[PDB]
Write a protein that binds this ligand. Structure first.
Ligand SMILES: CN(C[C@@H](O)Cn1ccnc1)c1ccc(Cl)cc1
Ligand SMILES: CN(C[C@@H](O)Cn1ccnc1)c1ccc(Cl)cc1
Lengths: 325, 325
């Protein structure tokens, strides 16, 4: 039912944006069909974790506060696709980093996807009292992610920034704000229950959940094989500021740091394997278990602090934090 | 006085955005100074024709309708830098089209510049009654330009679209909406005189002025030498849908079209020179003079239709259409 409605609203969103181009933007059918295939390629395929999070938070606040139900759930789906389209916009910008018409179309696709988040919001929320509030929080969160991408890309140019606090800074701005905090806020906006929740505790929960999931992704990037991870682990080659790096540098000897610095960031298969051996010999995956446990217990505690003033809100977070575990 | 105030507001805008990053975004001084040098590089340098247009329209409506004067002119400068920053955002995206950290920073710069237009608007216009109206027209015009870039980049893939009406479609969406229509509207918004002007006639004036200036740029791209034009003429090599191409194809013989199609879009110096020879032998620069004259007379006529309901508005357009001619 949640996914079946989310995909049905996608059809409603897509046919509006494409008809608007046809009727109000002088676009020819060939380019309309081209943009249909592009929209389906970049936006459809993922697990829709950010989009469905908005709907799961919205439906809890309705029955735990009737034509208002039909409107709030539809607004949640539009806000859900605003994030998914924004995610597609970020992914397209990532493809460019790694008279050529195929690169011009990639840049133009990234601009179109980002603009479509504004267009679907300005249309479906034209008579909603929160259109100005939603667009401002959406723009600021987008600005936050761009700042977070600067912290990550330049985390090795100016190993001084390989610290646990700067790692949190990267995860906070680059990932946590738009993946965890943004969908939760959108569930409170369409339900008209934003000032009824502790924003500080909700903020703190989003950063901790982002930290938990980013540490797990860093370990899986290095140790999970390609066929089981779904991609190729590239953090060691790209010299990223991963949780495995900042944890190793703290508990490594002066020689292990020298052997780490002389092999990190290289593309050579043997230098990358040398980095994995140091991670293995340092018992980092033993520290990974205890680190995620302490973070998980912080998530369990702050959910209780939020339910004293927002019971149904924490119920969605519990089911969303629980999920596949 | 206009430029001296415009640059002074730039200092006010820059120091806010950089301090906000320092105070509210956990940014270190090194990256703050990096973003200062990036902001000055991409935004400062041009002639500021779009930004100053907003101020010239605003100051006319004040004296031709006193603490309100100081506020409207400051709002005009902020709107002026919103367009200039948006122009820098488009230029940065153009540099990308023609683990590499220098390309990641270019993409990140394009996202930051675009986000800065929202941030300066959400701050300086926080208590203005037109913040929601301004952001929506700004976003739609930005969406319009992205659509116009699709018409231009794909104007030779799907010589069928080399027609005078499709050329106007490219100029209208890619250039005219944000270079001419957008600054004029921003002068009416900060002056609170938007519904007091004929939007249709104002729209028609912006498209005609964009058409006049785009035809002149196409001819200069092909005939003006590099040291006098300021760049290198690349339209013939890039196989662009320029005014010289669509005019030639109409008045060329069946052999001249064959000789044009077999040499257009190539990078060979002799094939490009063959295209220029056909443009010369077709007496196109004789048609260019009469074509700009007919367009110029349309601009002179529609200014009069607008002054019957907006005298001071047309006074700025006359001085702005007059300018260097
Ligand atoms: C977006 N999302 C699911 C995703 O982050 C989990 N994941 C996927 C890959 N690694 C971790 C999510 C959103 C809100 C809440 Cl409360 C909980 C989870
Ligand atoms: C932006 N601009 C000046 C620029 O277009 C002229 N130009 C520059 C290069 N080729 C042509 C402008 C804006 C509003 C009006 Cl009403 C008139 C002119």
């Amino acid at each position: 039912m949640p996914m079946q409605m989310f995909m049905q609203v996608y059809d409603e969103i897509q046919m509006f944006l494409l008809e608007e181009l046809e009727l109000k933007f002088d676009m020819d059918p060939n380019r309309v069909r081209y943009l249909r295939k592009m929209m389906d390629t970049t936006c459809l395929g993922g697990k829709y974790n950010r989009g469905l999070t908005v709907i799961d938070v919205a439906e809890s606040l309705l029955s735990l506060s009737g034509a208002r139900r039909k409107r709030v759930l539809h607004d949640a789906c539009v806000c859900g696709w605003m994030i998914e389209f924004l995610q597609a916009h970020y992914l397209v910008e990532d493809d460019i980093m790694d008279p050529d018409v195929t690169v011009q179309c990639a840049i133009n696709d990234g601009l179109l996807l980002k603009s479509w988040t504004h267009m679907m919001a300005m249309h479906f929320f034209a008579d909603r009292p929160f259109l100005q509030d939603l667009l401002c929080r959406f723009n600021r969160v987008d600005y936050t992610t761009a700042v977070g991408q600067l912290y990550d890309v330049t985390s090795m140019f100016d190993f001084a920034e390989f610290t646990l606090s700067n790692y949190k800074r990267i995860v906070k701005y680059k990932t946590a704000y738009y993946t965890y905090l943004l969908p939760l806020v959108m569930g409170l906006i369409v339900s008209e229950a934003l000032p009824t929740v502790d924003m500080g505790v909700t903020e703190e929960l989003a950063m901790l959940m982002g930290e938990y999931f980013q540490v797990q992704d860093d370990v899986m990037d290095c140790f999970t094989p390609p066929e089981r991870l779904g991609k190729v682990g590239t953090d060691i080659q790209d010299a990223k500021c991963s949780w495995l790096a900042v944890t190793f540098l703290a508990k490594a000897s002066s020689a292990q740091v020298a052997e780490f610095k002389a092999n990190y960031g290289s593309g050579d298969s043997e230098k990358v394997a040398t980095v994995r051996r140091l991670y293995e010999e340092a018992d980092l995956q033993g520290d990974y278990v205890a680190y995620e446990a302490a973070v998980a217990e912080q998530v369990k505690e702050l959910i209780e602090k939020l339910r004293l003033c927002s019971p149904g809100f924490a119920a969605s977070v519990e089911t969303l934090w629980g999920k596949t575990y």
